[PDB]
């Protein structure tokens, strides 16, 4: 057998792996160890990390709260403990480059909820956390992407709590943050991925609502262009590129009830981008029930999983 590339859905309820081509769904983990509020990343080498939540640390009188840091154990479908993130922040993003995992920006969980320009780095050889070169601006709710040992920071909200069209990139070899071309539409809490060597963004919150808009960025040319709008305005949409196909998954949308009420609603649906027609197409209404799920492309041995 060879591992198969699947959509991996992570939440407090467990981990579900979905093959969107066969429409087969598998239970990858029954563990609850991932905190509801979390972010996740998969390395090029298929290792899955999660950070989030909050807990009282054993050891620190000055800063008594830390955040969980976990790594998925492929042998027993449990989450392995790691040295915790010594920073009780939220609405941050996770990146990776060279032999480090990066926790980028965000805002403080407690008093005054300061927005952050700080970057915490987990050194995978030494097993220690520490501070890396700070961002050029404070930012939370942004998306972080990792490609060719660069770490991209896209959108979010800044020091005035307004949405950003900015994008910047970190090169750890040069210790250098650089500003890249901005998006057309400022957005936070949005979906983004690298796909066929370009960066694609979709949906998001804006300063006074939501957007369905999408855009595509050429890394080579440092230029944005419009991309097929997603069919619905949403917050916290996820994009996942899986063996050449772009998928859009979940997030919050507005339900109009029979009586005309406009109610926010959380979805775990999946759509695919039809490249030939340049259109989004529904795939499933609900992968599984979850709140606050994240989604990644992950290779797994299907014969070890429980079919659902």
Question: In which region does residue 116 sit, left (phi positive, over 0), alpha (psi from -120 to 50) or beta (all else)?
Answer: beta
Rounded to 5 degrees, φ, ψ at 78 are: -110, 165
Strands 245-256 and 14-19: unpaired
State the method.
Answer: X-ray
Per the CB < 8 A criterion, the answer to whether 215 and 227 are in contact is: yes
Experimental resolution (Å): 1.8
Third-level CATH fold of 1-308: Neuraminidase (2.120.10)
Calculated CA dihedral for residues 184, 186, 187, 188, nearest 10 degrees: 140
Distances (CA, A) of 175 to 59, 132, 142: 31, 9, 21
Contact (Cβ atoms closer than 8 angstroms) between residue 84 and residue 57: yes
Domain chopping of the chain, boundaries: 1-308
CB distance 87 to 66 below 8 Å: yes
């Amino acid at each position: 057998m060879f591992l198969q590339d699947l959509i991996f859905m992570i939440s407090e309820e467990g981990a579900v792996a979905y093959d969107p081509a066969a429409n087969e769904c598998y239970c990858a983990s029954l563990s609850s160890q991932v905190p509801k509020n979390h972010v996740s990343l998969v390395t090029k080498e298929n290792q899955v990390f999660v950070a989030g939540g909050l807990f009282y640390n054993e050891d620190n009188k000055e800063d008594p709260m830390s955040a969980y840091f976990l790594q998925f154990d492929h042998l027993d479908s449990e989450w392995l403990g790691m040295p915790p993130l010594p920073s009780p922040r939220c609405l941050f993003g996770l990146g990776e480059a060279l032999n480090s995992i990066y926790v980028v920006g965000g805002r403080e969980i407690k008093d005054g909820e300061r927005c952050l320009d700080s970057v915490m780095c987990y050194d995978r050889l030494s097993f220690k956390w520490g501070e890396s070169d700070p961002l050029p601006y404070v930012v939370y709710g942004h998306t972080v992407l990792s490609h060719m040992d660069l770490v991209y920071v896209i959108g979010g909200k800044g020091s005035d709590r307004k949405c950003l069209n900015k994008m910047c990139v970190y090169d750890p070899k040069k210790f250098e943050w650089k500003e890249l071309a901005p998006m057309q539409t400022a957005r936070s809490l949005f979906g983004a991925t690298v796909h066929d060597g370009r960066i694609i963004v979709a949906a998001g919150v804006t300063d006074t609502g939501l957007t369905s808009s999408a855009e595509v960025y050429s890394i080579t040319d440092n230029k944005w262009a419009p991309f097929e709008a997603f069919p619905q305005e949403r917050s916290s949409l996820s994009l996942v590129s899986l063996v050449g196909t772009l998928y859009a998954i979940g997030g919050f949308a507005t339900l109009e009830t029979e009586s005309g009420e406009l109610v926010p609603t959380e979805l775990n649906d999946i759509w695919r981008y039809n490249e030939e027609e340049k259109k989004w197409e529904g795939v499933l209404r609900e992968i599984a029930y979850a709140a606050g799920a994240t989604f990644l492309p992950v290779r797994l041995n299907v014969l070890r999983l429980t079919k659902m």
